[PDB]
Amino acid sequence: RYQLEAVKGTSDPAMLADTIAYHATWTVAEKQEILELTDLEARLKKVLGLLSRDLERFELDKRVAQRVKEQM
Amino acid sequence: AMRLPDGTLQVMVEARARAQVTDYIPGPYLRARGEVFSEIFPIDEAVVRVLVEELKEAFEKYVANHKSLRLD
């Protein structure tokens, strides 16, 4: 909850670019690969792609849990 | 025009009109001269207005496609 208000009201572009980049739970090699490219648009597109991937994985886990409990 | 000590020249130019080329002189530096100024004036502006409207609509429909191709 320390970031409940620490992230709202902030519009710094580089900070919002690298905040999720270091918040992205992946390997050090992937972090260095992210650091390799200096184009903001591509990196943030990758960030949104990772966010969507996490969302859909969570949806899959949810739905399987519910249905399997139901059929049980 | 702006001069820098690193050898890179930062100069702003604005094209005025098209013109022909008469002759070339062995340089450096190359020099050229023009005979007359090449200009064209619109005639029967109704079709030109239709084409301009189509061009504006095409540009409006095209500017909102390159999300990550560095397009303003």
DSSP three-state, residue B38: strand
**Phi/psi at A8 (5° precision):** -80, 145
Per the DSSP assignment, residues forming a β-bridge with B2 are: B10
| Percentage helix, strand, coil for chain A under 3-state DSSP, each rounded to 5 | 70, 0, 30
User: CA-CA distance, B66 to B72, in Å (whole number)?
Assistant: 9
| Residue A60 to residue B51: CA distance in whole angstroms | 51
Interface test with B, best of A37, A40, A41, A43 (most B CBs within 10 A): A41
> Residue A47 has which token pair?
């960030």
| Pairing state between β B18-19 and B37-38 | antiparallel
Q: How many CB atoms lie within 10 A of CB A47?
A: 19
Contact B38, B21 (CB under 8 A): no
B18 secondary structure, DSSP code: E
Tokens standing for residue B70: 């560095």
Stated in angstroms to one decimal place, the resolution of this structure is 3.4
Q: By CA distance, what is A43's nearest residue in B?
A: B68
Taking the Cβ of residue B61 and every Cβ of chain A, the question of whether any pair is shorter than 8 Å is answered with no
Beta strands in B2-62 (DSSP E): 18-19, 37-38
- Please tell me what DSSP assigns to residue A55: H
Structure tokens at B54: 């189509």
DSSP code of residue B39: -
